[PDB]
């Protein structure tokens, strides 16, 4: 405790998690009450259940602000959806997590990237429905989908929102590369950190 926590994959509508402002993708739950959630066990579930219908303090690390904040949630059986928080999580490390995005740079007209609607300089590719094996990356995926549709999650810094994008890489589209956009990776190519 350490760099591990429960990554917030998703939150349901009208859930205690949504009510409390837990943010899918960007948030990691790292503590509940005084308990540091640095091991993958039942502590989080067990404490939400032992405190059902009562306010509970979480600490939460957010990638877009790069700060830990405290969040009060009221776990509940009463809100009509699944779970006491209504959140989907996965035990994970936030240490290097924000490094694994790829920044869309210039986009050529008529290119695969343009046909997909990738937006120059404001789009960041953050995921896929494909699972990366270790030592694979975004370029692995582009390279193995020649002529095949690839479904990507993309975060946009200008609208501050995520959306699903499908791109069909095409080495024979006529211009350079199989995407026809530049891609940046590294220090100046991560999701902009927001003062909030």
């Amino acid at each position: 405790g350490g760099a591990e926590g429960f990554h917030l994959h998703g939150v349901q509508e009208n859930s205690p998690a949504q009510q409390a402002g837990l943010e899918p993708y960007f948030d990691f739950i790292i503590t509940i009450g005084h308990s540091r959630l640095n091991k993958e066990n039942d502590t989080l579930k067990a404490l939400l259940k032992a405190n059902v219908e009562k306010p509970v303090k979480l600490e939460v690390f957010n990638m877009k602000t790069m700060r830990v904040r405290e969040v009060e949630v009221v776990p509940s059986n009463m809100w009509g959806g699944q779970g006491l928080l209504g959140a989907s999580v996965r035990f994970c490390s936030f240490r290097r997590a924000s490094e694994q995005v790829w920044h869309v740079l210039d986009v050529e007209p008529s290119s695969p990237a343009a046909l997909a609607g990738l937006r120059p300089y404001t789009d960041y590719v953050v995921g896929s429905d494909q699972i990366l094996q270790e030592s694979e990356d975004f370029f692995t995926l582009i390279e193995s989908h020649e002529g095949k549709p690839l479904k990507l999650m993309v975060y946009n810094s200008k609208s501050d929102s995520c959306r699903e994008v499908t791109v069909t890489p095409n080495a024979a589209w006529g211009g350079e590369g199989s995407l026809g956009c530049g891609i940046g990776y590294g220090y100046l190519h991560r999701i902009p950190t927001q003062p909030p």
Partner: peptide, 22 residues
């Protein structure tokens, strides 16, 4: 339907990515 997986997710000991509802 098939879930969006952040690029920093890695498969488990069973080549699965289980996401938990809490």
């Amino acid at each position: 339907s098939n879930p969006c997986i952040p690029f920093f997710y890695r498969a488990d000991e069973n080549d699965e990515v289980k996401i938990t509802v809490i």
